[PDB]
Amino acid sequence: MDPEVFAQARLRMDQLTKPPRALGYLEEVALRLAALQGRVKPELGRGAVVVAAADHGVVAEGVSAYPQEVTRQMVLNFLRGGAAINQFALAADCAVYVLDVGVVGELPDHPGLLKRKVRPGTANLAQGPAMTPEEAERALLAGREAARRAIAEGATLLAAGDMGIGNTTAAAALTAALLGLPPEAVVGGEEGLRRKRQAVARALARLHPGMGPLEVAAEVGGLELVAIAGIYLEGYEAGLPLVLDGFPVTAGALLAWKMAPGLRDHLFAGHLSREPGHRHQLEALGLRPLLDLDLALGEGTGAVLAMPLLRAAARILHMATFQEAGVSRG
Amino acid sequence: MDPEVFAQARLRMDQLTKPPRALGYLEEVALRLAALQGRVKPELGRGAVVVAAADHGVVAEGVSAYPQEVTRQMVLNFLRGGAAINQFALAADCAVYVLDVGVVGELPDHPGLLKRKVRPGTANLAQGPAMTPEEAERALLAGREAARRAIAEGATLLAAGDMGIGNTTAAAALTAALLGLPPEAVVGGEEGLRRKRQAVARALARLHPGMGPLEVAAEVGGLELVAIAGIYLEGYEAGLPLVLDGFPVTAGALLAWKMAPGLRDHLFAGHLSREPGHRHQLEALGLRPLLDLDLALGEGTGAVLAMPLLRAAARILHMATFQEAGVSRG
Ligand code: NA
């Protein structure tokens, strides 16, 4: 972040040809992008989304209506361009990458697939540690690797996506843990809800004060959630603007944040998911969602949908000032 | 609007590879787009926004902090690409056309400008009829002409924009007259507030039974507002998805709706303006705003920012179904 650029950008903003605060929330977004890129007139282009996929042992708790096999079937769907993320990406000038860090089952070699399976799904987080600290570290590096490939190929904006049946439970556990919240706050039918909350509570019961973020993630998180933390850390270190998607993706962002506080300066909330716990995550991060379309899919869809808005926000500072355009002021 | 397609699209949506209702409000948008185009798999591309500009005699009532000259100066800004609308259009693959139906002062010939000045601004709507029915007709037709060129040049979705100092007062008067609302509901320093409400009340007082929508608009509206109705009427007849911008633009759409009841089915609310009366207009139209960014600028900015969302929505139906992708269900 460039303090000087921000100040210069703030001055220009106050001189652009539009009434004060007429572009609402987008004005703040533009100023942040200016400081982030160190340019008074920021500019975004081709974007990229790295969808991290992995399975969860907690599916044994009956926390999902879908069979575990859906995770792998969806990854194939991604590679063939039939998922929602593929379609939104086409409409948002965003490249799509897929990362396998823990899907149950073999996947074929494919141009858009990065195969770094750490293990065939995590252990049941309700009965014990989802993974070992070493496996967590491997997932983290995998996420960083994927992100680095996206960046190397020209990504100017980076978002993360998630795919994993039952990852909302793991997301809830990681969130409740990192934000010191109760199950009921991160888990919003009746009996499935019962299983999810109890699953989260049991997982939290294994934790204790003084634990590092990655240690907590390895205990109650998911492999793709840790990989997502890696995706964001790599993007952050690259100096790129980062876009948040839904609940599971944001949980991964919270992990990255706890590992690097300054990362929050590069975060932009793409949307507000229907997932109740998403609100708490955003408030903790002090971020306002750009979109609110009652989305509840994940895959990085909400993040990708917001990219055009971020590009538009950056262009605001490209507007003419009253002096440049010869426009009279109040 | 094809009911058969709407039904077929609704069926495909329910079978796409994602949880039911997982894509929230965008699913309804997709279905409407499919029905409008008469294709289960709608496709959108280049968009266009026609920004109608004209001055208002009501500025004499002290209803704006900006001098009247700003309308003409902003039109020049549009032609030089320094306005917010130009920046947003760049990020949303949307052509920008400007239509002068009543700006005070001369403008240079320009390929992106349609010069159809009806008169140098309207008369003061608080003291008498803003324009004659004959002038309103010319403004309406100028709007159709500009929209037709946008369409002839390839627009697949159409939005209207407004530029006119003091037009929120004319928009309030027209809205109140068409919807039968009081000045208090449509109008939003306190002294300015008060004079705007009085201006609106005065205009309404001149109305009487037996007046056609065009006669009403001529009496209390603005030239660009009537032109905006023409833009939407032309887009409606061309069978295109139409996108609403802010308060003044939506006032123009209400006029078009009153002249053509079925036009409402082609409308999409781009965003929710900070202008108090905007929500009332959208409620009267029964439309849900896609964006809510606290924008209060106009120019068609909100509508243009929503175009990428409309394109994304159309692509949803291009996703693979469970059966097509070989994904198990739940
Ligand atoms: Na008079």
Side-chain angles (χ1 to χ4, degrees), chain A residues 36 48 50 140 143-152 155-160 227-243 256 263 266-267:
Chain A
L36 195 161
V50 181
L140 188 67
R144 276 165 171 279
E145 194 190 322
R148 177 90 265 149
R149 175 192 174 184
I151 301 176
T156 67
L157 231 186
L158 183 67
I228 289 171
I231 291 166
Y232 284 133
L233 289 171
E234 194 64 30
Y236 169 58
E237 297 174 3
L240 300 195
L242 314 172
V243 194
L263 177 146
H266 291 229
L267 291 177

Side-chain angles (χ1 to χ4, degrees), chain B residues 5-20:
Chain B
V5 172
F6 204 139
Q8 297 298 300
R10 197 182 297 138
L11 294 187
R12 183 179 179 73
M13 181 66 72
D14 182 62
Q15 289 301 295
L16 295 183
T17 52
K18 45 79 173 183

Side-chain angles (χ1 to χ4, degrees), chain A residues 17 19 21-23 25 66 69 73 77 82 84 87-88 274 288 291-296 315 319-320 327-328 330, chain B residues 17 19 21-25 65-66 69 73 77 82 87 274 288 291-293 295-296 312 315 318-320 327-328:
Chain A
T17 55
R21 301 160 291 107
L23 288 177
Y25 181 56
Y66 297 105
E69 52 184 286
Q73 301 175 324
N77 192 192
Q87 298 308 310
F88 287 172
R274 185 188 313 159
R288 172 186 166 70
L291 301 169
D292 191 339
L293 300 166
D294 187 36
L295 304 185
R315 288 301 303 198
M319 283 173 60
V327 175
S328 298
Chain B
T17 52
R21 302 166 259 106
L23 291 179
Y25 183 43
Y66 293 102
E69 60 189 306
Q73 303 174 329
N77 197 193
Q87 300 314 313
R274 185 189 312 157
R288 177 185 184 300
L291 299 168
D292 191 334
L293 300 166
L295 304 178
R315 298 303 306 185
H318 290 257
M319 284 172 67
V327 178
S328 305

Side-chain angles (χ1 to χ4, degrees), chain B residues 231-295:
Chain B
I231 291 166
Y232 285 125
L233 287 174
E234 186 68 25
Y236 168 55
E237 283 157 31
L240 296 186
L242 311 174
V243 190
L244 296 176
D245 186 41
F247 188 56
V249 166
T250 302
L254 286 177
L255 176 54
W257 179 43
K258 292 306 173 184
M259 293 169 74
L263 181 143
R264 187 187 92 58
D265 300 314
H266 285 241
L267 297 180
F268 291 86
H271 73 136
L272 178 60
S273 173
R274 185 189 312 157
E275 276 285 339
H278 201 206
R279 174 59 87 185
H280 294 297
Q281 298 174 317
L282 294 184
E283 288 294 292
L285 285 163
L287 302 172
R288 177 185 184 300
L290 286 172
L291 299 168
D292 191 334
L293 300 166
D294 186 41
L295 304 178

Side-chain angles (χ1 to χ4, degrees), chain B residues 131 136-137 139-140 214 217-218 222-231 252 255:
Chain B
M131 70 199 88
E137 173 66 9
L140 182 83
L214 196 60
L223 292 155
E224 82 274 38
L225 303 187
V226 176
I228 284 166
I231 291 166
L255 176 54

Side-chain angles (χ1 to χ4, degrees), chain B residues 123-142:
Chain B
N124 189 340
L125 69 86
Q127 308 295 343
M131 70 199 88
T132 63
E134 186 277 332
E135 297 174 321
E137 173 66 9
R138 281 188 279 150
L140 182 83
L141 297 175

Side-chain angles (χ1 to χ4, degrees), chain B residues 167-181:
Chain B
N167 77 355
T168 66
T169 295
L174 179 57
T175 297
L178 300 181
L179 303 184
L181 295 175

